[PDB]
From a paper:
Here, we present the crystal structure of the SOBIR1 ectodomain from A. thaliana (AtSOBIR1) and discuss its implications for plant immune signalling. However, both an active kinase domain and the SOBIR1 LRR ectodomain are required for signalling. The crystal structure of the SOBIR1 ectodomain reveals five LRRs sandwiched between unusual N-terminal and C-terminal capping domains. SERK1 shares the number of LRRs and the N-terminal capping domain with SOBIR1, but has a canonical, disulfide-bond-stabilized C-terminal cap. Analysis of the crystal packing with the PISA server revealed a rather small complex interface of ∼1000 Å2 formed by several salt bridges, hydrogen bonds and a few hydrophobic contacts.
The plant membrane receptor kinase SOBIR1 is a central regulator of plant immunity. SOBIR1 and RLPs are likely to form heteromeric signalling complexes.
Numbering used by the authors: 34 to 56, 64 to 224
The structure:
């Protein structure tokens, strides 16, 4: 029996509180998934938080900047809540992120261009929010398999690079009135 990493545990508390997830080793239950890893110190095996999955829980909070302290995070799934305000730039510290699913919330603001640094992203579902600005951050997300930005306020055009993505099997940017497709 392993224990959860002390730092991940402390970060999880603040993240859940700010999301609105209401009430020691939370791994493997209630939306928290962990994986066995070598600890920074010691080298002994410890559990790290790798997935936060909180669909359909009537959450009304926000994504705390402390999300960036979960260095091993692979999945943040927050679909079908009432979460508000901006996607924090601190999520760029989650370099291993593969799944970012924020569909059907009320997230607002813009996505900064350096979101393209999340090179491992495979599933990016921002659909049905109130996000705005351009989609230049998609330029270098070459591993995307599932991409939806539908039903937002995005404008400009899809980056031409999307034409070269080889794994893209689901793509939706409908419901963005001032948004045009990728064109040369
Ligand atoms: C990614 O780019 C964004 C936008 O330029 C950066 O956001 C700024 O972050 C600093 C803290 O590092 C804040 O004080 C600023 O207010 C933010 N600006 C905006 C417009 O939100 C972000 O820091 C960049 N991150 C990385 C890793 O490059
Ligand atoms: Cl879920």
């Amino acid at each position: 029996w392993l224990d959860i990493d002390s730092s991940d545990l402390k970060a999880l508390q603040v993240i859940e509180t700010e999301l609105g997830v209401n009430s020691v080793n939370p791994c493997g239950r209630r939306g928290v998934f962990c994986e066995r890893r070598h600890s920074a110190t010691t080298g002994e095996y410890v559990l790290r938080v790798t997935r936060l999955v909180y669909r359909s829980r009537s959450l009304t909070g926000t994504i705390s900047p402390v999300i960036g302290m979960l260095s091993e995070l692979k999945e943040l799934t927050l679909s079908n809540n009432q979460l508000v305000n901006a996607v924090p730039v601190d999520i760029l510290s989650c370099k291993q992120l593969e799944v970012l699913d924020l569909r059907k919330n009320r997230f607002s603001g813009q996505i900064p261009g350096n979101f393209s640094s999340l090179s491992r992203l495979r599933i990016l579902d921002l659909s049905s929010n109130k996000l705005s600005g351009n989609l230049n951050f998609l330029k270098n997300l070459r591993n995307l398999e599932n991409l939806s930005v539908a039903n937002n306020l995005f404008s400009g055009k899809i980056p031409e690079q999307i034409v070269s993505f080889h794994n893209l099997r689901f793509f939706d940017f409908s419901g963005n009135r001032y948004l045009e497709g990728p064109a040369p």
